[PDB]
Each structure stands twice: as C-alpha cells, then as structure tokens.
PDB file of C-alpha atoms and ligand atoms in Angstrom:
ATOM      1  CA  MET J   1      -7.809 -35.106  73.381  1.00 59.40           C
ATOM      2  CA  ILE J   2     -11.125 -35.899  75.085  1.00 57.76           C
ATOM      3  CA  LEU J   3     -11.491 -39.038  77.190  1.00 57.06           C
ATOM      4  CA  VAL J   4     -14.497 -40.649  78.860  1.00 60.13           C
ATOM      5  CA  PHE J   5     -14.077 -43.040  81.758  1.00 58.42           C
ATOM      6  CA  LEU J   6     -17.010 -45.431  81.965  1.00 60.09           C
ATOM      7  CA  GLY J   7     -17.745 -48.148  84.532  1.00 59.70           C
ATOM      8  CA  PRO J   8     -19.404 -49.169  87.798  1.00 60.89           C
ATOM      9  CA  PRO J   9     -18.940 -47.160  90.991  1.00 60.91           C
ATOM     10  CA  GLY J  10     -15.744 -48.291  92.749  1.00 61.68           C
ATOM     11  CA  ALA J  11     -14.009 -49.339  89.517  1.00 61.90           C
ATOM     12  CA  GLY J  12     -11.191 -46.829  90.157  1.00 59.36           C
ATOM     13  CA  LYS J  13     -12.154 -44.163  87.596  1.00 60.72           C
ATOM     14  CA  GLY J  14     -11.519 -41.163  89.859  1.00 65.29           C
ATOM     15  CA  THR J  15      -8.197 -42.561  91.027  1.00 65.74           C
ATOM     16  CA  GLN J  16      -6.957 -42.991  87.460  1.00 65.49           C
ATOM     17  CA  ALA J  17      -8.414 -39.678  86.279  1.00 65.66           C
ATOM     18  CA  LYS J  18      -6.634 -37.746  89.043  1.00 64.51           C
ATOM     19  CA  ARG J  19      -3.296 -39.364  88.242  1.00 62.09           C
ATOM     20  CA  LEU J  20      -3.644 -38.771  84.513  1.00 64.06           C
ATOM     21  CA  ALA J  21      -4.569 -35.131  85.166  1.00 64.63           C
ATOM     22  CA  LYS J  22      -1.602 -34.631  87.487  1.00 65.60           C
ATOM     23  CA  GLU J  23       1.003 -36.419  85.368  1.00 64.35           C
ATOM     24  CA  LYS J  24      -0.204 -35.785  81.814  1.00 65.66           C
ATOM     25  CA  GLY J  25      -1.821 -32.349  82.158  1.00 60.63           C
ATOM     26  CA  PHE J  26      -5.477 -33.250  81.488  1.00 61.03           C
ATOM     27  CA  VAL J  27      -8.370 -31.192  82.823  1.00 60.21           C
ATOM     28  CA  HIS J  28     -10.285 -33.571  85.135  1.00 57.97           C
ATOM     29  CA  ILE J  29     -14.061 -33.123  85.039  1.00 58.24           C
ATOM     30  CA  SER J  30     -15.646 -35.291  87.729  1.00 59.63           C
ATOM     31  CA  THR J  31     -19.401 -34.778  87.908  1.00 61.99           C
ATOM     32  CA  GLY J  32     -19.323 -36.583  91.265  1.00 61.90           C
ATOM     33  CA  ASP J  33     -16.779 -34.182  92.782  1.00 61.87           C
ATOM     34  CA  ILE J  34     -18.513 -31.134  91.320  1.00 61.01           C
ATOM     35  CA  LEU J  35     -21.905 -32.267  92.620  1.00 59.88           C
ATOM     36  CA  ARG J  36     -20.570 -33.091  96.079  1.00 56.96           C
ATOM     37  CA  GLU J  37     -19.077 -29.599  96.301  1.00 58.22           C
ATOM     38  CA  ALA J  38     -22.346 -28.043  95.116  1.00 62.77           C
ATOM     39  CA  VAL J  39     -24.200 -29.939  97.849  1.00 61.70           C
ATOM     40  CA  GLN J  40     -21.717 -28.744 100.500  1.00 62.42           C
ATOM     41  CA  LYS J  41     -21.995 -25.146  99.258  1.00 60.67           C
ATOM     42  CA  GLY J  42     -25.796 -25.297  99.026  1.00 59.07           C
ATOM     43  CA  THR J  43     -25.995 -23.878  95.505  1.00 56.12           C
ATOM     44  CA  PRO J  44     -29.194 -24.262  93.491  1.00 52.43           C
ATOM     45  CA  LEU J  45     -27.657 -27.273  91.709  1.00 52.02           C
ATOM     46  CA  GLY J  46     -26.492 -28.691  95.042  1.00 53.14           C
ATOM     47  CA  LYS J  47     -29.788 -28.364  96.849  1.00 51.03           C
ATOM     48  CA  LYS J  48     -31.634 -30.002  93.959  1.00 56.87           C
ATOM     49  CA  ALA J  49     -29.055 -32.766  93.389  1.00 58.13           C
ATOM     50  CA  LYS J  50     -28.742 -33.769  97.052  1.00 59.92           C
ATOM     51  CA  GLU J  51     -31.712 -36.062  97.376  1.00 60.11           C
ATOM     52  CA  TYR J  52     -30.945 -38.009  94.195  1.00 62.87           C
ATOM     53  CA  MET J  53     -27.349 -38.553  95.305  1.00 62.96           C
ATOM     54  CA  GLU J  54     -28.382 -39.627  98.796  1.00 62.28           C
ATOM     55  CA  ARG J  55     -30.674 -42.287  97.311  1.00 57.97           C
ATOM     56  CA  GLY J  56     -27.993 -43.488  94.904  1.00 59.11           C
ATOM     57  CA  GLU J  57     -30.013 -42.279  91.911  1.00 59.22           C
ATOM     58  CA  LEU J  58     -28.690 -40.250  89.009  1.00 56.77           C
ATOM     59  CA  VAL J  59     -29.187 -36.516  89.149  1.00 56.42           C
ATOM     60  CA  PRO J  60     -31.590 -35.550  86.303  1.00 56.65           C
ATOM     61  CA  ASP J  61     -30.061 -35.178  82.843  1.00 56.51           C
ATOM     62  CA  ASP J  62     -31.075 -31.529  82.380  1.00 54.72           C
ATOM     63  CA  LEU J  63     -29.133 -30.437  85.438  1.00 51.07           C
ATOM     64  CA  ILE J  64     -26.034 -32.390  84.450  1.00 54.95           C
ATOM     65  CA  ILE J  65     -26.039 -31.257  80.817  1.00 54.07           C
ATOM     66  CA  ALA J  66     -26.211 -27.625  81.948  1.00 55.59           C
ATOM     67  CA  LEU J  67     -23.368 -28.231  84.394  1.00 54.13           C
ATOM     68  CA  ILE J  68     -21.115 -29.729  81.703  1.00 55.44           C
ATOM     69  CA  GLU J  69     -21.932 -26.910  79.264  1.00 53.96           C
ATOM     70  CA  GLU J  70     -20.946 -24.427  81.943  1.00 57.18           C
ATOM     71  CA  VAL J  71     -17.668 -26.053  82.950  1.00 54.50           C
ATOM     72  CA  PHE J  72     -16.329 -27.518  79.715  1.00 50.34           C
ATOM     73  CA  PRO J  73     -12.933 -25.876  79.130  1.00 50.13           C
ATOM     74  CA  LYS J  74     -12.253 -23.745  76.053  1.00 45.26           C
ATOM     75  CA  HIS J  75      -8.870 -25.436  75.684  1.00 44.41           C
ATOM     76  CA  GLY J  76      -6.921 -28.382  77.054  1.00 42.31           C
ATOM     77  CA  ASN J  77      -7.209 -32.146  77.035  1.00 43.55           C
ATOM     78  CA  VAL J  78     -10.160 -33.362  79.080  1.00 42.85           C
ATOM     79  CA  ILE J  79     -11.064 -36.446  81.087  1.00 42.34           C
ATOM     80  CA  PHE J  80     -14.776 -36.829  81.646  1.00 44.63           C
ATOM     81  CA  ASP J  81     -14.922 -38.927  84.750  1.00 42.82           C
ATOM     82  CA  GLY J  82     -18.355 -40.359  85.482  1.00 41.31           C
ATOM     83  CA  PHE J  83     -19.950 -38.360  82.670  1.00 41.78           C
ATOM     84  CA  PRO J  84     -21.885 -39.213  80.582  1.00 41.29           C
ATOM     85  CA  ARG J  85     -23.963 -41.625  82.698  1.00 45.39           C
ATOM     86  CA  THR J  86     -27.001 -41.899  80.414  1.00 48.66           C
ATOM     87  CA  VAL J  87     -27.597 -42.069  76.659  1.00 47.88           C
ATOM     88  CA  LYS J  88     -29.202 -38.605  76.683  1.00 48.97           C
ATOM     89  CA  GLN J  89     -26.100 -37.238  78.368  1.00 45.52           C
ATOM     90  CA  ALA J  90     -23.907 -38.920  75.724  1.00 44.95           C
ATOM     91  CA  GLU J  91     -25.998 -37.456  72.894  1.00 41.67           C
ATOM     92  CA  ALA J  92     -25.759 -34.008  74.490  1.00 42.22           C
ATOM     93  CA  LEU J  93     -21.977 -34.373  74.874  1.00 38.64           C
ATOM     94  CA  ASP J  94     -21.585 -35.301  71.215  1.00 37.03           C
ATOM     95  CA  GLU J  95     -23.539 -32.219  70.184  1.00 36.81           C
ATOM     96  CA  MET J  96     -21.612 -29.920  72.505  1.00 34.52           C
ATOM     97  CA  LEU J  97     -18.339 -31.228  71.075  1.00 41.50           C
ATOM     98  CA  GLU J  98     -19.500 -31.006  67.441  1.00 37.92           C
ATOM     99  CA  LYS J  99     -20.225 -27.310  67.927  1.00 38.53           C
ATOM    100  CA  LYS J 100     -16.628 -26.847  69.083  1.00 37.58           C
ATOM    101  CA  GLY J 101     -15.156 -28.972  66.281  1.00 38.29           C
ATOM    102  CA  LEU J 102     -14.161 -31.636  68.836  1.00 37.21           C
ATOM    103  CA  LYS J 103     -15.146 -35.226  69.557  1.00 36.58           C
ATOM    104  CA  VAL J 104     -14.740 -37.940  72.151  1.00 34.57           C
ATOM    105  CA  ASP J 105     -11.450 -39.623  71.261  1.00 33.69           C
ATOM    106  CA  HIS J 106     -11.431 -42.661  73.543  1.00 32.90           C
ATOM    107  CA  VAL J 107     -13.927 -44.223  75.896  1.00 34.35           C
ATOM    108  CA  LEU J 108     -12.388 -46.492  78.498  1.00 28.02           C
ATOM    109  CA  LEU J 109     -14.606 -49.136  80.035  1.00 27.63           C
ATOM    110  CA  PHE J 110     -13.316 -50.025  83.487  1.00 30.86           C
ATOM    111  CA  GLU J 111     -14.230 -53.708  83.533  1.00 35.00           C
ATOM    112  CA  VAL J 112     -14.362 -55.207  87.033  1.00 34.52           C
ATOM    113  CA  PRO J 113     -16.608 -57.655  88.928  1.00 36.38           C
ATOM    114  CA  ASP J 114     -19.222 -56.632  91.521  1.00 39.76           C
ATOM    115  CA  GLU J 115     -17.533 -58.187  94.548  1.00 36.84           C
ATOM    116  CA  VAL J 116     -14.420 -56.134  93.800  1.00 35.50           C
ATOM    117  CA  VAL J 117     -16.218 -52.801  93.546  1.00 35.69           C
ATOM    118  CA  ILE J 118     -18.290 -53.582  96.644  1.00 40.09           C
ATOM    119  CA  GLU J 119     -15.135 -54.096  98.736  1.00 38.00           C
ATOM    120  CA  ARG J 120     -13.563 -50.997  97.216  1.00 41.01           C
ATOM    121  CA  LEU J 121     -16.590 -48.866  98.025  1.00 41.99           C
ATOM    122  CA  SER J 122     -17.081 -50.300 101.530  1.00 42.42           C
ATOM    123  CA  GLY J 123     -13.464 -49.472 102.359  1.00 41.32           C
ATOM    124  CA  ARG J 124     -13.324 -46.052 100.709  1.00 40.76           C
ATOM    125  CA  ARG J 125     -12.410 -43.106 102.954  1.00 42.76           C
ATOM    126  CA  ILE J 126     -11.959 -39.395 102.201  1.00 41.85           C
ATOM    127  CA  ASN J 127      -9.830 -36.684 103.804  1.00 41.84           C
ATOM    128  CA  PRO J 128     -12.447 -33.893 104.023  1.00 42.53           C
ATOM    129  CA  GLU J 129      -9.757 -31.187 104.147  1.00 41.16           C
ATOM    130  CA  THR J 130      -7.962 -32.114 100.927  1.00 46.26           C
ATOM    131  CA  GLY J 131     -10.506 -34.355  99.220  1.00 43.51           C
ATOM    132  CA  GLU J 132      -7.930 -37.139  98.970  1.00 44.77           C
ATOM    133  CA  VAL J 133      -9.308 -40.657  98.549  1.00 47.36           C
ATOM    134  CA  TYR J 134      -8.028 -43.642 100.531  1.00 42.58           C
ATOM    135  CA  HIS J 135      -8.980 -47.262 101.107  1.00 44.60           C
ATOM    136  CA  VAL J 136      -8.739 -48.867 104.540  1.00 48.28           C
ATOM    137  CA  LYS J 137      -6.990 -51.893 103.036  1.00 45.77           C
ATOM    138  CA  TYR J 138      -5.539 -50.973  99.641  1.00 45.10           C
ATOM    139  CA  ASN J 139      -4.368 -47.430 100.423  1.00 45.09           C
ATOM    140  CA  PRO J 140      -4.773 -46.589 104.117  1.00 45.65           C
ATOM    141  CA  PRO J 141      -4.866 -42.948 105.199  1.00 45.30           C
ATOM    142  CA  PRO J 142      -1.812 -41.755 107.148  1.00 46.10           C
ATOM    143  CA  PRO J 143      -1.947 -42.039 110.943  1.00 44.37           C
ATOM    144  CA  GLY J 144      -3.307 -38.838 112.477  1.00 45.16           C
ATOM    145  CA  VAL J 145      -5.329 -37.870 109.412  1.00 43.19           C
ATOM    146  CA  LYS J 146      -9.063 -37.682 110.120  1.00 43.69           C
ATOM    147  CA  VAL J 147     -11.111 -39.266 107.338  1.00 40.12           C
ATOM    148  CA  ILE J 148     -14.794 -39.770 106.626  1.00 38.20           C
ATOM    149  CA  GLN J 149     -16.961 -42.297 104.859  1.00 40.09           C
ATOM    150  CA  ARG J 150     -19.304 -41.142 102.110  1.00 37.06           C
ATOM    151  CA  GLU J 151     -22.950 -41.724 103.038  1.00 36.54           C
ATOM    152  CA  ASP J 152     -23.564 -43.169  99.588  1.00 37.31           C
ATOM    153  CA  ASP J 153     -20.848 -45.762 100.233  1.00 35.71           C
ATOM    154  CA  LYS J 154     -23.204 -47.506 102.687  1.00 36.07           C
ATOM    155  CA  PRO J 155     -24.224 -51.071 101.705  1.00 36.47           C
ATOM    156  CA  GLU J 156     -27.806 -50.289 100.670  1.00 35.93           C
ATOM    157  CA  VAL J 157     -26.873 -47.197  98.681  1.00 34.89           C
ATOM    158  CA  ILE J 158     -24.040 -49.121  97.001  1.00 32.41           C
ATOM    159  CA  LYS J 159     -26.586 -51.714  95.886  1.00 32.43           C
ATOM    160  CA  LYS J 160     -28.769 -48.993  94.335  1.00 30.50           C
ATOM    161  CA  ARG J 161     -25.840 -47.294  92.567  1.00 29.89           C
ATOM    162  CA  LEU J 162     -24.896 -50.618  90.974  1.00 30.23           C
ATOM    163  CA  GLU J 163     -28.509 -51.246  89.878  1.00 34.30           C
ATOM    164  CA  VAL J 164     -28.565 -47.738  88.382  1.00 33.61           C
ATOM    165  CA  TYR J 165     -25.265 -48.364  86.583  1.00 34.59           C
ATOM    166  CA  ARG J 166     -26.538 -51.574  85.005  1.00 30.64           C
ATOM    167  CA  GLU J 167     -29.868 -50.013  83.967  1.00 34.18           C
ATOM    168  CA  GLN J 168     -28.877 -46.543  82.777  1.00 29.97           C
ATOM    169  CA  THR J 169     -25.128 -46.365  82.241  1.00 31.18           C
ATOM    170  CA  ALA J 170     -24.148 -49.755  80.834  1.00 31.90           C
ATOM    171  CA  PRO J 171     -26.110 -49.007  77.590  1.00 33.69           C
ATOM    172  CA  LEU J 172     -23.307 -46.520  76.819  1.00 34.28           C
ATOM    173  CA  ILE J 173     -20.949 -49.427  76.194  1.00 34.65           C
ATOM    174  CA  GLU J 174     -22.748 -50.355  72.955  1.00 36.51           C
ATOM    175  CA  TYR J 175     -23.316 -46.650  72.177  1.00 33.98           C
ATOM    176  CA  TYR J 176     -19.577 -46.050  72.107  1.00 37.49           C
ATOM    177  CA  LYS J 177     -18.564 -49.430  70.723  1.00 36.02           C
ATOM    178  CA  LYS J 178     -20.549 -48.589  67.568  1.00 34.23           C
ATOM    179  CA  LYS J 179     -18.493 -45.392  67.259  1.00 32.77           C
ATOM    180  CA  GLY J 180     -15.324 -47.491  67.272  1.00 32.16           C
ATOM    181  CA  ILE J 181     -13.793 -45.608  70.201  1.00 34.42           C
ATOM    182  CA  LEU J 182     -14.399 -48.017  73.077  1.00 38.42           C
ATOM    183  CA  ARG J 183     -11.464 -49.749  74.715  1.00 37.40           C
ATOM    184  CA  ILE J 184     -11.671 -52.128  77.648  1.00 36.42           C
ATOM    185  CA  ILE J 185      -9.501 -51.737  80.752  1.00 34.74           C
ATOM    186  CA  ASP J 186      -8.993 -54.559  83.273  1.00 38.39           C
ATOM    187  CA  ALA J 187      -9.887 -52.449  86.294  1.00 36.94           C
ATOM    188  CA  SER J 188      -9.551 -55.366  88.731  1.00 38.95           C
ATOM    189  CA  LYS J 189      -5.740 -55.048  88.700  1.00 38.26           C
ATOM    190  CA  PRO J 190      -3.619 -52.925  91.083  1.00 35.37           C
ATOM    191  CA  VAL J 191      -3.528 -49.147  90.577  1.00 34.16           C
ATOM    192  CA  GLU J 192      -0.156 -49.054  88.798  1.00 33.21           C
ATOM    193  CA  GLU J 193      -1.117 -51.810  86.343  1.00 31.32           C
ATOM    194  CA  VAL J 194      -4.438 -50.172  85.526  1.00 29.01           C
ATOM    195  CA  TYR J 195      -2.658 -46.868  84.929  1.00 27.97           C
ATOM    196  CA  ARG J 196      -0.230 -48.475  82.480  1.00 27.26           C
ATOM    197  CA  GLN J 197      -3.150 -49.881  80.494  1.00 25.22           C
ATOM    198  CA  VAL J 198      -4.895 -46.499  80.505  1.00 23.06           C
ATOM    199  CA  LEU J 199      -1.777 -44.922  79.006  1.00 23.75           C
ATOM    200  CA  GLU J 200      -1.511 -47.703  76.427  1.00 21.52           C
ATOM    201  CA  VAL J 201      -5.088 -47.361  75.175  1.00 25.36           C
ATOM    202  CA  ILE J 202      -4.895 -43.570  74.770  1.00 30.44           C
ATOM    203  CA  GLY J 203      -1.676 -43.849  72.769  1.00 32.57           C
ATOM    204  CA  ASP J 204       0.683 -42.487  75.395  1.00 36.89           C
ATOM    205  CA  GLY J 205       4.224 -43.847  75.535  1.00 35.60           C
ATOM    206  CA  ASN J 206       4.386 -43.868  79.361  1.00 32.06           C
TER     207      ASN J 206
HETATM  208  N1  LIG O   1      -6.841 -50.624  91.247  1.00 30.41           N
HETATM  209  C1  LIG O   1      -7.297 -50.519  92.519  1.00 30.41           C
HETATM  210  N2  LIG O   1      -7.084 -51.487  93.440  1.00 30.41           N
HETATM  211  C2  LIG O   1      -7.535 -51.371  94.706  1.00 30.41           C
HETATM  212  N3  LIG O   1      -8.233 -50.318  95.171  1.00 30.41           N
HETATM  213  C3  LIG O   1      -8.510 -49.286  94.339  1.00 30.41           C
HETATM  214  C4  LIG O   1      -8.051 -49.323  92.949  1.00 30.41           C
HETATM  215  N4  LIG O   1      -8.471 -48.181  92.371  1.00 30.41           N
HETATM  216  C5  LIG O   1      -9.136 -47.471  93.312  1.00 30.41           C
HETATM  217  N5  LIG O   1      -9.132 -48.127  94.495  1.00 30.41           N
HETATM  218  C6  LIG O   1      -9.800 -47.730  95.747  1.00 30.41           C
HETATM  219  O1  LIG O   1     -11.159 -48.138  95.521  1.00 30.41           O
HETATM  220  C7  LIG O   1     -12.072 -47.108  95.893  1.00 30.41           C
HETATM  221  C8  LIG O   1     -12.824 -46.631  94.655  1.00 30.41           C
HETATM  222  O2  LIG O   1     -11.923 -45.947  93.787  1.00 30.41           O
HETATM  223  P1  LIG O   1     -12.419 -44.629  93.027  1.00 30.41           P
HETATM  224  O3  LIG O   1     -11.263 -44.166  92.199  1.00 30.41           O
HETATM  225  O4  LIG O   1     -13.069 -43.713  94.022  1.00 30.41           O
HETATM  226  O5  LIG O   1     -13.506 -45.310  92.044  1.00 30.41           O
HETATM  227  P2  LIG O   1     -14.705 -44.634  91.196  1.00 30.41           P
HETATM  228  O6  LIG O   1     -14.281 -43.188  90.907  1.00 30.41           O
HETATM  229  O7  LIG O   1     -14.728 -45.464  89.936  1.00 30.41           O
HETATM  230  O8  LIG O   1     -15.923 -44.819  92.059  1.00 30.41           O
HETATM  231  C9  LIG O   1     -11.235 -46.030  96.563  1.00 30.41           C
HETATM  232  O9  LIG O   1     -11.262 -46.317  97.968  1.00 30.41           O
HETATM  233  C10 LIG O   1      -9.819 -46.241  96.053  1.00 30.41           C
HETATM  234  O10 LIG O   1      -8.854 -45.929  97.061  1.00 30.41           O
HETATM  235  N1  LIG O   2     -23.093 -37.766  85.025  1.00 28.73           N
HETATM  236  C1  LIG O   2     -23.960 -37.873  86.071  1.00 28.73           C
HETATM  237  N2  LIG O   2     -25.303 -37.870  85.902  1.00 28.73           N
HETATM  238  C2  LIG O   2     -26.185 -37.960  86.918  1.00 28.73           C
HETATM  239  N3  LIG O   2     -25.798 -38.067  88.204  1.00 28.73           N
HETATM  240  C3  LIG O   2     -24.481 -38.082  88.511  1.00 28.73           C
HETATM  241  C4  LIG O   2     -23.466 -37.986  87.454  1.00 28.73           C
HETATM  242  N4  LIG O   2     -22.258 -38.020  88.055  1.00 28.73           N
HETATM  243  C5  LIG O   2     -22.476 -38.146  89.384  1.00 28.73           C
HETATM  244  N5  LIG O   2     -23.795 -38.182  89.648  1.00 28.73           N
HETATM  245  C6  LIG O   2     -24.420 -38.271  90.976  1.00 28.73           C
HETATM  246  O1  LIG O   2     -23.396 -38.172  91.943  1.00 28.73           O
HETATM  247  C7  LIG O   2     -23.271 -39.432  92.661  1.00 28.73           C
HETATM  248  C8  LIG O   2     -21.810 -39.722  92.894  1.00 28.73           C
HETATM  249  O2  LIG O   2     -21.125 -39.823  91.652  1.00 28.73           O
HETATM  250  P1  LIG O   2     -19.813 -40.718  91.481  1.00 28.73           P
HETATM  251  O3  LIG O   2     -18.872 -40.122  92.490  1.00 28.73           O
HETATM  252  O4  LIG O   2     -19.429 -40.474  90.040  1.00 28.73           O
HETATM  253  O5  LIG O   2     -20.272 -42.120  91.799  1.00 28.73           O
HETATM  254  C9  LIG O   2     -23.987 -40.430  91.766  1.00 28.73           C
HETATM  255  O6  LIG O   2     -24.405 -41.589  92.452  1.00 28.73           O
HETATM  256  C10 LIG O   2     -25.125 -39.604  91.196  1.00 28.73           C
HETATM  257  O7  LIG O   2     -26.138 -39.398  92.169  1.00 28.73           O
END
C-alpha cells in the first residue's frame, strides 16, 4: 500500500504519518524531515535546498525527484508525507511506481482552514535531540525539555508557504481526484479523531 498525504502546512500530516508508521508498520517518507536533515548535515542536497526552504519556497523538482528515487523502499507499505508537492513531482512518482508494478493507492487531502494551520504553525515546537514535534497549546513539551521553533514557522515565512501551497500544490487535488483515489479528511478535528478517519479511508479496521 502506497499513501500520499496532501494539504497545507500545519494540517497535521506529519503527526498522522508518524503515528500510522509506528502503529501500522508503514515506511514514513517525509521530504521535509529528509531535507531538514540534509541541511543540518551540509550534504550537496542540503546546501542547495537550504535557501529555498528558508524563503518558504519549494525545493526544485529535479532535486526532489532524485531524492525520492534514491530513498523509495524496495518493499513495505509507504506513506509519502509532503510529497508530491507539484504536478511534475506527481507525474514522476507515477512513473517510478509503474516501473515497479506499484501505484498510489490513496491520496488523503487534509482539509483545514487557514486560521487553524496558522495557529498550529505559530505554536509548533521541536525537540532537537529526538525530532519530536509539540505544540505550545495543543501538545506542550514536557517540563525540562529544551525545544526550538523552526525558522520557517515565522509569520512571514508561513504566509509564503501557504501561498506556495495554493499555487503549486493544490492543483494535485484535481490531479488525484480524476484518478479516483482522492479522499478528504477533516483535518481541523483533534488528533485522535483525524487518525480514526485516516484509518477509515485507507480501509483499516482500527
Ligand atoms: N489535529 C490537531 N489538532 C491540534 N494540533 C495539531 C493537530 N495535528 C497536529 N497538530 C500540531 O500542529 C502543528 C502542525 O502539525 P504537523 O503534523 O507538523 O503538520 P504538517 O506536517 O502538516 O505541517 C504541530 O505543532 C502539531 O503538534
Ligand atoms: N516535495 C517537496 N518538494 C519541494 N520542496 C519540499 C518538498 N517537501 C518539503 N519541501 C521543502 O521543505 C520545506 C518544509 O517541508 P514541510 O515540512 O513538508 O512543510 C518546504 O517548505 C519546502 O521548502
């Protein structure tokens, strides 16, 4: 089974992908997490990606397609989390899967209003030692745990990331709807409720 999580930044895609991977055995491919690590390590991908990320722009398609080709697992169920983000990426994914006799099975659109994702992003915190994601209101970090704020979670960069989503990524909704594999998730609900709907749409009995 191959899943794609699609939606605005702050919709809760990473949170749901991590839980599904932990509980249901999926391989979690987060282009965001992989890119952030590349930046921290200063790899050729990282050094090139850094400035796009910092501006809230998408990293160029060529770099991302190569990344996915390199890391796509030979076996296992997969959650693509924040990939594809453009039509060219989606076309490349389809071709990569075809060559392996596979296909995208479900695309989940995390539907949620702007004011919700803006509060979620503004309040997002990360434990730099474990990578664990918190929210100052909805899931506070434990006392005594040092956390950081992502630079791209600043108000002006958030604005850009949302603009980019609406311009470049939202066209994937129709792309996948035409394939008959798009299902809509109410991502505005609490974490547990969203997770139950995720399981429902992918045909899991929970
Ligand atoms: N259903 C939810 N309700 C409230 N807060 C959430 C929910 N899902 C995620 N969060 C919080 O919102 C922020 C964004 O979630 P995240 O999973 O990082 O979203 P994305 O990967 O779509 O950008 C994080 O701080 C996370 O703790
Ligand atoms: N599939 C992708 N294509 C291009 N850029 C990406 C992709 N995934 C993540 N990024 C970059 O990484 C940043 C953080 O990703 P995310 O954590 O998914 O919001 C984005 O704002 C982009 O700069």
